[PDB]
Amino acid sequence: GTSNRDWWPNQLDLSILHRHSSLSDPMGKDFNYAQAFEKLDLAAVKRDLHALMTTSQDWWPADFGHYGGLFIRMAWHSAGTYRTADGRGGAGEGQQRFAPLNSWPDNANLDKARRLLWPIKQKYGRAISWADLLILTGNVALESMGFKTFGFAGGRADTWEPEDVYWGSEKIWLELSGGPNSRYSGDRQLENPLAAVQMGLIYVNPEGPDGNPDPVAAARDIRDTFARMAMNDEETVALIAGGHTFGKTHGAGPASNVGAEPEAAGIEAQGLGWKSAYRTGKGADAITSGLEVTWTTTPTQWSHNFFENLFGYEWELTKSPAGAHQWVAKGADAVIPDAFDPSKKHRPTMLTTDLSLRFDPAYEKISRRFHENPEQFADAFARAWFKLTHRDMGPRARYLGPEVPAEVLLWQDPIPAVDHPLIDAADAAELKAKVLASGLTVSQLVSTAWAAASTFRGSDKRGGANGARIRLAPQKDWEANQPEQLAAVLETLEAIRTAFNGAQRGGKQVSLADLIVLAGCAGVEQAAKNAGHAVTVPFAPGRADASQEQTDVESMAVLEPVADGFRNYLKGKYRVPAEVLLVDKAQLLTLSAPEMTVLLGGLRVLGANVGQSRHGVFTAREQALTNDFFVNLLDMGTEWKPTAADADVFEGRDRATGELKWTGTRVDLVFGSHSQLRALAEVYGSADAQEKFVRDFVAVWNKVMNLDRFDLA
Amino acid sequence: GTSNRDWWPNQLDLSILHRHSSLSDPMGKDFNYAQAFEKLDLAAVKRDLHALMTTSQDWWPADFGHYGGLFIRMAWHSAGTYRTADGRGGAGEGQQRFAPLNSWPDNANLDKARRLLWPIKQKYGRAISWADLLILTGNVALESMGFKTFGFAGGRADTWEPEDVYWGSEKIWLELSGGPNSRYSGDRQLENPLAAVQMGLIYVNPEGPDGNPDPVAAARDIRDTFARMAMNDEETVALIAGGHTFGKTHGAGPASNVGAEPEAAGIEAQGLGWKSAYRTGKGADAITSGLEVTWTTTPTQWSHNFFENLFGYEWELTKSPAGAHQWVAKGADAVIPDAFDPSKKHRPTMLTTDLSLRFDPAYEKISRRFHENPEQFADAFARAWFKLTHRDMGPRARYLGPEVPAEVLLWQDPIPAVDHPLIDAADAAELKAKVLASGLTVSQLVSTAWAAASTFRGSDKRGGANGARIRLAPQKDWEANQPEQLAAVLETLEAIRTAFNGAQRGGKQVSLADLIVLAGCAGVEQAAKNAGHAVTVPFAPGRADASQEQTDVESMAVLEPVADGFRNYLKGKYRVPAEVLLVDKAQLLTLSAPEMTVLLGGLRVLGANVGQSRHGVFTAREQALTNDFFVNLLDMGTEWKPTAADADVFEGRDRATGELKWTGTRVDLVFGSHSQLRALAEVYGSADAQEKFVRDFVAVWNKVMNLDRFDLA
Ligand code: HEM
Ligand code: HEM
Ligand SMILES: Nc1ncnc2c1ncn2[C@@H]1O[C@H](COP(=O)(O)O)[C@@H](O)[C@H]1O
Ligand SMILES: NNC(=O)c1ccncc1
Ligand SMILES: [Cl-]
Numbered sequence A, B: 001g002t003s004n005r006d007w008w009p010n011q012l013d014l015s016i017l018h019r020h021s022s023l024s025d026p027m028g029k030d031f032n033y034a035q036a037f038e039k040l041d042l043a044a045v046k047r048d049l050h051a052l053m054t055t056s057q058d059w060w061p062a063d064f065g066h067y068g069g070l071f072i073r074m075a076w077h078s079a080g081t082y083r084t085a086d087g088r089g090g091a092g093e094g095q096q097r098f099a100p101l102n103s104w105p106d107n108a109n110l111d112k113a114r115r116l117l118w119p120i121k122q123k124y125g126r127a128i129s130w131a132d133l134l135i136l137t138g139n140v141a142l143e144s145m146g147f148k149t150f151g152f153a154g155g156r157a158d159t160w161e162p163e164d165v166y167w168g169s170e171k172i173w174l175e176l177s178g179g180p181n182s183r184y185s186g187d188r189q190l191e192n193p194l195a196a197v198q199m200g201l202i203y204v205n206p207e208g209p210d211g212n213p214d215p216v217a218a219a220r221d222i223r224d225t226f227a228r229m230a231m232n233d234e235e236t237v238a239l240i241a242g243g244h245t246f247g248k249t250h251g252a253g254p255a256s257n258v259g260a261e262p263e264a265a266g267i268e269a270q271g272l273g274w275k276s277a278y279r280t281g282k283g284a285d286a287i288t289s290g291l292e293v294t295w296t297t298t299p300t301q302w303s304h305n306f307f308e309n310l311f312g313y314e315w316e317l318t319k320s321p322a323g324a325h326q327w328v329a330k331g332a333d334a335v336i337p338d339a340f341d342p343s344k345k346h347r348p349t350m351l352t353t354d355l356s357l358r359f360d361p362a363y364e365k366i367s368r369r370f371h372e373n374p375e376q377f378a379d380a381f382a383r384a385w386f387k388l389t390h391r392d393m394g395p396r397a398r399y400l401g402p403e404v405p406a407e408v409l410l411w412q413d414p415i416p417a418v419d420h421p422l423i424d425a426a427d428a429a430e431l432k433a434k435v436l437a438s439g440l441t442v443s444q445l446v447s448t449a450w451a452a453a454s455t456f457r458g459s460d461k462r463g464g465a466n467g468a469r470i471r472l473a474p475q476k477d478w479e480a481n482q483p484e485q486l487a488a489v490l491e492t493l494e495a496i497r498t499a500f501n502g503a504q505r506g507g508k509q510v511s512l513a514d515l516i517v518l519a520g521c522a523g524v525e526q527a528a529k530n531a532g533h534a535v536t537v538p539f540a541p542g543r544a545d546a547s548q549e550q551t552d553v554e555s556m557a558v559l560e561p562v563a564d565g566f567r568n569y570l571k572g573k574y575r576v577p578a579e580v581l582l583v584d585k586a587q588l589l590t591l592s593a594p595e596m597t598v599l600l601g602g603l604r605v606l607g608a609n610v611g612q613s614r615h616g617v618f619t620a621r622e623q624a625l626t627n628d629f630f631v632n633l634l635d636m637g638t639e640w641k642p643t644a645a646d647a648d649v650f651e652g653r654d655r656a657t658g659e660l661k662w663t664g665t666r667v668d669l670v671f672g673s674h675s676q677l678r679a680l681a682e683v684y685g686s687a688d689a690q691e692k693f694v695r696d697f698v699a700v701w702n703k704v705m706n707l708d709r710f711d712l713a
């Protein structure tokens, strides 16, 4: 059956904004996962998971009699898809159980791991999500094997269909670099937003870069991909050495024995995949990666043996029984136990990527310090495992249950507790009147509040106006935020705040974070008034102001908007067309297509464009909230053409006279071109739609202002 | 960006069940189109459209100074996608404005027609849908040119995204038959459910079959395609001769002048397409189909000149300026006016497909009668145009506004008016107890009510339990409906009804249509009771009983279910896997994936399978409403394999002992295989889900029972 995607393979895809509707969701529209989880007996679930660790099933027998290593890898993989570039991937939505991640080659046989968990999932039902269960099971695996975790938070609601994520353009699984859809260019630069070296891998290739077994070169890839998953050198060495303290790899025979991945298998496989014709197909005969490495002398117990082996032998290149490159300890005794046969032992072995930890010079120093000071290794690994597995969960307000660590960590972008009375409605009116009397313009108020609130992304729940981080480095210096204008607005707001706060009794004060948002609301009210409409814009107080020391400047850099269609901003020229980047941003903002449409049309006429550009400002009453953008965009009296200077800018001329009326970008004009977007524009550009436009705009404005307000959830 | 569809191109596509969410809809959740339309001043809209017919725009100048022919073609195309096989296509959702239909080659330059209508759409806003406006504009075109229409009904609500429709497998627009994706096999058999001869055409090729200009052969294709659009010979001739009484074709120069269709054009084209480099690109230079035919001497007025010309001249094969085959009248005077130059005239011309009306022997008789009796022609055309343009609107209860014809037409599957008091809640309880006391079983009651209600399809809103047509030909003899069992159930219900009705005062009585549904509800209540649960199943009375004489038997044939996954029924072996046919059915029933899932699992254990098959009956308490289907399906203690006898049937055996536990079909097992479906099955198979399963089952059961109840909208 030929589809629209076949006929117009580069048209824009709006379905990404309309996933996750109530239609695909089996839970009622009233289901609240946080409330269900709060009633879960978490201790009881952890007792069942402890029991599961050594209850081997015949259909996938446990190595060493203990599933701990398998489950740690399962949890690591659930979390390990994460990219800091867009916040997409991670454990937070339980996406490992859906295509494509359920069938990635690096997730081979994790289908068996997930299936082992079905009895517990069934027992507890909706009170524990798959997403939480995958992570909890990793924690319990670690605890069972002697390792004390830093903590655990529930609250990851399950999702019910695959996310739309750009995982790369390759059409072959695991394609090596340099092909027609290469993710690499230049001096082995990985394209943003990607965070893995090959399609279907988590981070790097365990044999080495593109299969070449050079541990020094592999270190380069490790460092780059882990950085792109928010991990520095110390965390990276702690995580790899930590994880590879446990368990083993599986490569007992040639890879050609392994059949179809889950999404390709027959219906009788009942959701499992990679069935193997090699001997029994499982247990001692298991094939997963094709490598055959067991790192420690006690694979089911926490030890300091990883670094003892790493530094204690010299390593020789060799091949697994599937033909894969791996390393064996020169002249070692057979000290490693076998997984099934008590009468066999093996020499210590390593992956190329394990040797990276010793032969990259910066890693080597960390690895040595961890070898000499295992307490530091244990602490770093615990902190890094917590980070890895919670990275995409958002503000601390979302953390549920009795095991949440009390220590606040820098990576969480923390927000101080509010310890004073909040402003009430009378105080809000007083502050909005002051803001309006100060001489700040609609355009300045709207642009500042948009700049503050629209850093939010729902993918990892980072960003938003809470914290007033727009006043700190680096947000205050981002080109999209118009630094000089921003500084003048913030200075006027700060004086207003200082004056209000100094006049108070009883400890009441207003944060700058709240006042920025409140001032934006006043701007929207004033604009509606300018258009002859009487509008109150909703406002919820309670934001607090974070300090510069609570704001990691490097980590913040990935939230910089290099494309923001809502302010008609593009930081440079990109391979991806700007309207694709607009839809991408709308998706991160959690907007539907109707919301994106109304929001953008309104921002254009309120003066939210960067640099005061006239592009898309299709009104003669700027700073008045009207549907002018739509009515003028859809006017057939105007003809549009790309400019001579720039193919991405368009001139709109009176069809009869030739006179120039407007200019716009691809982002402006896509609303009059794409057939679904134009149908939306039509609704708002109709003669009966003025009040609907205003009201819809206020609702989406308020939605954006509140995106990070999990303290009110 | 590689997607799941690229990696697993034959996985099942569930997104088709999740279109039309509230996310994609710009109207609020409470918007009621029927209410808006009822207040539209329809006379005022029609006066604006009348004025439009002769107000030429220079960007697409009106042929002969009148847009009427163009708009008639627009409306005919809007309706002309319709297929009787599945009810899909037609004018009822305004789908012509979305991909792919907006860009079909047969719809070239209808983009210009739709754009002409924007000022009127904008004026009246939400009170008239595009869907309604396309049709209304065709009616007004006809009226403006002297033709009396049979009537008009509003009520087609707009849609906001493309429908997922199988339009064929070809990857090339207009591909000739016999290719690798040929829609033809055998002796020029068109594959179901298709109703056009080539990808991107409405019905047939105007040059003739695969371009061969033989009017006799073309008549074969016309007859076949029009039948597949619910039109018989009389209707077909009336429609083609009717339409081709007006306007002209456009083929003023070579087709290679014509650029990209709308979905492929640049953003500056603002949703228009087919931009032509030939001379001025429009008006006298227009190119659309590539043919250049003007049929009558007054292209802007109703006449009987099409048949006068058809029969009055002999015809010669010729070529348009774009190279297309067409026909010219041998030795005629130049009597046909030019579209732009009052000093030029032309000889009468025809399409190969127009000549079909004269040279096919059965058409020729009808055409002769219409020629001799143009009043008969006018009446047939008006009836056929009404039918064409309303065929997918559903029951008469959906027809809005002041121009609805009072005459009830056989094709409407009409339902008589109810002229008596309805049963109340206490009466419903009394009848449910009587049904249960008669000894009809849960399985008989459920099966019968499902058979009656599940003929509904949302694509053309035909079918459903209203009318009690399950008791008439042909429904009562469909194999899926189990004719002998059905007859025994209907007999018992009829006696119950006759007794209840004869005991009444005051004219109160119950229809057999209501009682079939009510009896099904009793069946579901009893089943819930068998499981130890007390529920009340909702029931709305007001169905009426249609007669055999009000039931066109041939038209009803397309509603026969040849695949019904919900009763594990397949009438023969098909190309398409049964699980794809299940999803197809659920989409016709308007079900989401969660609704399909709950509904099927519940029907399995209530005994709704055809022939009492045990396939998928994963319970030891048949006729009790439990979630046993899911708990047993997901039990990893059971292993499944295809049978030796049949690859489409599977045995489930105890994994440890090999003991046979169950059998199932692909439809049963897909819920344990497909990763999104199995995630739904898990919800219902969890230990906390019994109450939820019952509640959700009852809700979806009730939804199905009410699908055709537009009398209560
Ligand atoms: C450079 C990064 C890494 C690479 C290239 C890598 C590679 C691998 C490979 C190839 C396997 C064997 C899969 C199989 O054949 O069954 C494996 C196993 C494992 N890895 Fe990693 N790994 C990496 C980082 C991590 C991290 C961050 C963790 C956890 C904190 C981890 C924990 C594990 C565990 C527990 C196993 C054993 C699985 C079992 O016992 O079944 N690894 N790793
Ligand atoms: C075998 C069936 C049919 C064939 C092959 C067919 C073919 C065509 C073609 C090729 C054109 C010219 C497109 C162009 O170059 O602009 C056309 C025009 C037209 N057709 Fe049809 N037609 C059929 C049936 C119908 C029916 C059922 C109607 C309406 C009741 C209709 C009404 C018209 C009208 C009004 C025009 C003129 C458009 C204008 O003035 O711009 N046709 N037809
Ligand atoms: N552009 C490249 N392509 C492939 N391998 C590279 C590239 N650049 C560096 N390497 C490998 O990474 C190692 C570490 O180099 P560097 O990361 O430049 O200090 C080198 O010695 C190479 O083996
Ligand atoms: N692909 N996933 C996201 O982009 C996302 C997920 C949840 N809320 C917002 C965005
Ligand atoms: Cl994601």
Ligand SMILES: [Cl-]
Pocket (backbone or CB within 6 Å): B088, B089, B090, B095, B163, B165, B459
């Ligand atoms: Cl459709």
Ligand code: NA
Pocket (backbone or CB within 6 Å): A087, A088, A089, A090, A092, A392, A458, A459, A460
């Ligand atoms: Na994420």
Ligand code: NA
Pocket (backbone or CB within 6 Å): B087, B088, B089, B090, B092, B392, B458, B459, B460
């Ligand atoms: Na339809």
